Design a protein around this ligand. Structure first.
Ligand SMILES: Nc1ncnc2c1ncn2[C@@H]1O[C@H](COP(=O)(O)OP(=O)(O)OP(=O)(O)O)[C@@H](O)[C@H]1O
Ligand SMILES: [Mg+2]
Length: 842
């Protein structure tokens, strides 16, 4: 009885009126009632509390007197000081009130019965108090809100508009918005960085096919058994108090894992590859959230004795270390130590064990008669890299007698890229669920890549295109790849363009931040020094220079694979260690921290550093191989690459930028100073087919300027230049926006202008062209200063003067008129009109 279906037959429309919001509401209420939801009339919170009282008394087999019920209400159900986050805490964690009655007896009052899910009462009400809405009540509590809109209302624009009193609606867990054609759901959270339209979701089948229209969505997502499982078992409330409602592919993998455990155990078919399986969920789609959730659910199987959740120490960061601290405290870090692991093994009244693959492998090497070897064990592995996982499989196959193991990866091991390691299929067995990169990009759940070799260094181009590895390793020195000029030109390019790439030029726009991945410890030292020197230079030239805050971290290591670096700082050579030492000193003075480079300090520095790159206390992080495979930073959008990446390491590193955020983060920028074009196509193609690169890789500057057709859709996209031309041709101004119609058409057109400029801000050709508009062509020093900073010659310089762009004045005239029209939105038809709210606020 899976809740993400393998097969689904589309319902038929009634033939009745299905245009207005009250049309959608009629059929939704009717459909929900056919599915066992009792409709009640509720006109007040007083009537809501009364209904809650009836449902919780039924559920819990107990009758409150009135004084008790008022007390229950003021102190647990409906505390006046509770906010949304407090009700989510109560739904997901604190759902049992141990209540003391007037006669002093003690009873557990459940808000929700989680073990007997179907015992919960589900009800529907319509909106009471202009807005058409239906609310699903679970034991009288409002947990879902369905916002209904007219057909042909832009669902996105409606979302922007709506995202005490009455306080019971703080309990809402889930939103659904629908114009009948499209239906999206999203979590009720106060975290604004999770509140953008990018975080709404379509329901779907296990093959990932969308289920969009409200009638089908009603009959699938809104089956009591579906919706209640989504609400209770497939929504995560983490240690940072963020509610995340899982996407269908995440749920689809999870339930298929659990069902596979049970049928294997019932078949007494354990400890073979046909006992478990793997999940192919593409990089950045939620493997770490999902696999961890599936491990937590697995502990609720009464016949399993211990569930191992295994991560790679390479992949740890602040948020996930905070998470794991709650379940396996002081045990999930970067050290080789197993004391914490073996202590959590001995904890009774506990089934989940989080650990790293380095630790699990160490313990299994040294220990031989652990009780857990003969128990019923689930293994859930979250992207464990090739070399350490290989030795761990040997001892696991050797020593666990009754296990069911599962793996999540975004970059499987096929015959073609095996050389050395066992294929993913041979280790884990069947592919239980797949959600691949073209799946995720079509669903807009990860971001595309803009990948460009920055070929502006002729003296060094020969090296930066070298392909023999022997030669490439031999060029990691100051005569070649670490030539001070090359390091300077590259570092200068990054300082001249960081704000352009991260969307920080036109303030007070927050923007994004970036990483720089390099080839070696010496490379990191040269770059950190050059940045330092070049920024002290800029501080003297201009006194209005605003510096970037730069940091680095690395230790010592040891195709496709990114080298594993140890957390044992005593492994490094004296020079690397004293450099990393001096960097932490500067880091300490700035952030008023006090980390050292002993093991404990380095580990805490690593943990602080991840936090500050994620929240942009750091502008640019320089690494060799750390934070390249698991680090989750939605507001990081640019990876500067001076490194030879291939195959799965390529996919992982680039994907540091691939997190969706809002409409300002159109894709991740990958700026490379070695030519990685062949490697990018080879790596994309290895994890898809020959067409996959056309979905993953962004179009050229000429395409966004002049227009193209998205082959994935058939959607013609107008070019910037066509838009700009239409703006002048049809709106040379103020009299052009006289009539309502002309106002609507202008908003539509200027919205495309804003989408196109924001895309084009990531193209060096466009930044160069914008820069030229701010120049005295008579002034020859500033003409020469622009040529050298944008790498244009006298020929290229000639051509760009001919490209006519609209003046800053006419743009800000467009901008404020656009705002007028937006704020006025309090014959002609405004429903389909999406204002570009995020791009504005930028
Ligand atoms: N269902 C969801 N709802 C809301 N947010 C989500 C959901 N799934 C993933 N995210 C967000 O997307 C980001 C990436 O998730 P996560 O790091 O678990 O992915 P991953 O696949 O392990 O990535 P990597 O391949 O880089 O290790 C996180 O910030 C996460 O909170
Ligand atoms: Mg991960």
């Amino acid at each position: 009885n899976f809740i993400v279906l393998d097969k689904y037959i589309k319902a038929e429309p009634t033939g009745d009126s299905y245009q207005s919001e009250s049309d959608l509401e009629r059929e939704l209420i009717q459909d929900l009632r056919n599915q066992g939801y009792e409709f009640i009339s509720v006109k007040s919170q007083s009537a809501m509390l009364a209904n809650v009282r009836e449902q919780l008394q039924n559920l819990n087999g107990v009758v409150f007197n009135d004084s008790e019920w008022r007390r229950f209400t003021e102190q647990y159900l409906d505390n006046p000081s509770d906010g949304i986050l407090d009700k989510t805490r109560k739904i997901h964690i604190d759902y049992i009130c141990d209540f003391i009655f007037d006669d002093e007896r003690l009873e557990n009052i459940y808000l929700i019965d989680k073990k007997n899910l179907m015992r919960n009462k589900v009800q529907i009400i319509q909106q009471f108090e202009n807005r058409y809405d239906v609310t699903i009540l679970v034991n009288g509590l409002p947990l879902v809100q369905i916002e209904l809109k007219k057909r042909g209302v832009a669902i996105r624009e409606a979302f922007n508009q709506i995202h005490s009193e009455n306080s019971l609606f703080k309990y809402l867990q889930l939103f659904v918005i629908s114009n009948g054609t499209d239906t999206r759901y999203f979590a009720n959270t106060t975290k604004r960085d999770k509140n953008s339209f990018d975080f709404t979701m379509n329901w779907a089948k296990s093959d990932n096919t969308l289920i969009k229209d409200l009638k089908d969505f009603t009959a699938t997502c809104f089956q009591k058994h579906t919706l209640l499982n989504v609400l209770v078992n497939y929504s995560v409330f983490d240690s940072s108090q963020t509610l995340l409602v899982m996407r269908p592919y995440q749920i689809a993998a999870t339930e298929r894992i659990l069902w596979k455990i049970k049928s294997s155990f019932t078949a007494k078919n354990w400890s073979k590859p046909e006992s478990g399986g793997y999940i192919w969920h593409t990089t950045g789609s939620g493997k770490t959230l999902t696999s961890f959730k599936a491990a937590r659910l697995a502990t609720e199987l009464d016949f399993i004795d211990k569930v191992f959740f295994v991560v790679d120490r390479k992949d740890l960061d602040y948020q996930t270390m905070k998470e794991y601290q709650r379940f396996s405290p002081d045990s999930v870090n970067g050290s080789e130590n197993t004391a914490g692991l073996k202590r959590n093994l001995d904890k009774d009244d506990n089934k989940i064990i989080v650990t790293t693959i380095q630790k699990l492998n160490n313990l299994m090497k040294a220990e031989s008669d652990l009780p857990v070897y003969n128990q019923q064990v689930v293994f859930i592995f979250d992207e464990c890299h090739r070399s350490q996982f290989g030795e761990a499989q040997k001892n696991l196959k050797k020593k666990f007698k009754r296990y069911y193991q599962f793996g999540f990866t975004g970059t499987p091991i096929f015959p073609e890229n095996a050389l050395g390691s066992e294929t993913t299929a041979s280790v884990f067995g069947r592919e239980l669920h797949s959600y691949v990169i073209t799946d995720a990009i079509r669903d807009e759940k990860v971001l595309k890549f803009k990948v460009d070799y920055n070929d502006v260094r002729p003296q060094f181009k020969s090296l930066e295109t070298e392909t023999d590895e022997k030669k490439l390793s031999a060029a990691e020195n100051q005569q070649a790849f670490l030539h001070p000029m090359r390091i300077q030109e590259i570092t200068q390019y990054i300082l001249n363009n960081f704000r352009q790439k991260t969307h920080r030029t036109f303030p007070g726009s927050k923007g994004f931040n970036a990483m720089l991945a390099v080839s070696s410890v010496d490379a990191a030292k040269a770059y950190y020094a050059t940045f330092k020197r070049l920024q002290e230079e800029a501080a003297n030239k201009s006194a209005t220079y605003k510096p970037l805050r730069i940091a680095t971290i690395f230790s010592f290591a040891a195709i496709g694979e990114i080298s594993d670096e140890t957390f044992d700082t005593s492994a490094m050579d004296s020079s690397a260690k004293e450099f990393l030492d001096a960097a932490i000193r500067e880091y300490n003075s700035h952030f008023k921290t006090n980390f050292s480079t002993d093991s404990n300090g380095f580990q805490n520095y690593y943990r602080d550093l991840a936090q500050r790159v994620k929240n942009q206390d750091i502008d640019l992080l320089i690494v060799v191989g750390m934070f390249l495979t698991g680090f989750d930073a939605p507001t990081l959008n640019t990876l500067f690459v001076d490194k030879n990446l291939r195959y799965h390491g390529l996919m992982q590193a680039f994907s540091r930028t691939n997190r969706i955020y809002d409409a300002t983060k159109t894709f991740g920028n990958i700026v490379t100073f070695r030519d990685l074009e062949r490697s990018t196509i080879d790596a994309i193609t290895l994890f898809g087919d020959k067409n996959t690169k056309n979905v993953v890789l962004e179009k050229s500057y000429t395409e966004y300027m002049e227009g193209f057709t998205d082959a994935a859709t058939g959607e013609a996209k107008r070019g910037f230049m066509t838009v700009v031309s239409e703006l002048e041709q049809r709106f040379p101004d103020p009299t052009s926006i006289e009539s309502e119609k002309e106002k609507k058409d202008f908003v539509k057109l200027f919205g495309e202008y804003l989408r196109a400029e924001n895309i084009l801000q990531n193209y060096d050709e466009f930044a160069t062209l914008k820069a030229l508009q701010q120049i005295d062509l008579s002034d020859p020093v500033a003409v020469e200063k622009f040529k050298a900073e944008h790498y244009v010659d006298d020929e290229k310089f000639a051509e760009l003067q001919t490209i006519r762009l609209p003046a800053d004045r006419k743009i800000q005239d467009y901008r404020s008129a656009y705002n007028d029209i937006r704020d006025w939105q309090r014959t002609t038809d405004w429903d389909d009109v999406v204002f570009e709210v995020d791009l504005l606020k930028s």
